Amino acid sequence: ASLTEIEHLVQSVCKSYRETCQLRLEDLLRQRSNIFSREEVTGYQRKSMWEMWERCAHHLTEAIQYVVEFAKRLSGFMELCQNDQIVLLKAGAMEVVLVRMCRAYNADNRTVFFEGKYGGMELFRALGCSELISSIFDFSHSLSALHFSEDEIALYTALVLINAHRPGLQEKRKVEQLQYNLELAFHHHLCKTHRQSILAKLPPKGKLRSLCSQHVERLQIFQHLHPI
Numbered sequence: 419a420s421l422t423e424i425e426h427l428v429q430s431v432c433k434s435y436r437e438t439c440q441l442r443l444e445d446l447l448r449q450r451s452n453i454f455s456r457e458e459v460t461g462y463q464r465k466s467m468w469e470m471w472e473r474c475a476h477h478l479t480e481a482i483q484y485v486v487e488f489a490k491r492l493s494g495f496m497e498l499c500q501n502d503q504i505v506l507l508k509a510g511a512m513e514v515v516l517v518r519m520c521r522a523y524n525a526d527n528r529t530v531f532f533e534g535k536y537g538g539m540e541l542f543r544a545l546g547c548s549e550l551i552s553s554i555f556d557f558s559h560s561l562s563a564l565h566f567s568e569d570e571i572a573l574y575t576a577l578v579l580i581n582a583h584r585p586g587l588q589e590k591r592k593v594e595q596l597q598y599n600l601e602l603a604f605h606h607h608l609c610k611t612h613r614q615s616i617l618a619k620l621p622p623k624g625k626l627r628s629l630c631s632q633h634v635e636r637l638q639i640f641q642h643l644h645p646i
C-alpha cells in the first residue's frame with residue numbers, strides 16, 4: 419500500500435464516520451445553551467433505576483447501531499471473515515460509543531446532551547453509581563480538552579474497533595493488515611494537520627477498556643440477556 423492509497427483510507431474513514439455520527443456537531447454545539455432546569459433534573463432523579471436503565475439501554479442500542487454502520491462502511495472490514503466482524507464489533511463498539519460521547523460533552527459546565535437538553539452527572543443519579551458515571555464524565559472531559567476534530571475521532575474510533583489483539587479472531591493476519599494500515603493512516607493525518615502532539619496525550623491504553631467493562635458490569639444486572 420503506497421501513500422496515495424493511505425490517503426484514500428483516511429478519506430474513506432472520514433466519509434464513513436461523517437455519515438454515521440448520529441448528530442451533526444453543529445446541532446450539538448448550538449444546543450449547549452439549552453439546559454435542563456433543576457425541576458427537569460429532579461424529574462429524572464425521581465425515576466426508577468429500572469426506568470433510567472431501560473432508557474439508557476435504548477439510547478445505547480440506538481448508538482451501537484450507528485457504530486455497526488460505521489464499521490460496515492470501512493472497506494476491509496466488510497472483507498473480513500463473518501465471525502471476526504462480530505468478535506471485533508462485540509469487544510469494540512462500546513468503547514467507540516464512549517469516545518463518541520465527547521462530542522456531546524460540554525466542558526464549560528460539565529454537561530452532556532441527553533434526550534434533548536444538556537445535563538450534568540447528577541441527572542443519572544437513579545442508576546446509583548455516581549462513581550462510574552463521573553469517571554465516564556472525566557474521560558469525556560479530558561478528551562474535550564484535546565479539542566478532538568471530527569476526522570481525528572473517525573480515525574481514532576476505527577482504531578478502537580480494528581484490534582487484532584481481540585480474543586476469538588480466526589483470520590488474525592487479515593485484521594493486522596487492516597490495523598497497521600489504519601495506524602499509519604492515523605499518523606499520516608496528524609502530520610498533514612500538524613497534530614502529532616495529541617498522540618502523546620491520548621487516553622491511557624484500556625482506561626477506556628476498564629470503563630466499558632464496568633458499564634456492562636452494571637447493564638448485565640438490569641438488562642440481562644438483552645441483544646447487547
Ligand SMILES: CCn1c(=O)c2cc(NC(=O)C[C@H](C)CC(=O)Nc3ccc(C#N)c(Cl)c3)ccc2n(CC)c1=O
Nearest residue numbers: 440441474477478481515516519522530531532533554
Ligand atoms: C456509552 C457511554 N455513555 C455515553 O456515550 C452517553 C452519551 C450521551 N449523549 C450523547 O451521546 C449524545 C447523543 C446524540 C444522544 C444520546 O443521548 N446518546 C447516548 C449514547 C449512549 C448512552 C449510554 N449509555 C446514552 Cl445514556 C446516550 C448521554 C449519556 C451517556 N452515558 C450515560 C452518562 C454514557 O454512559
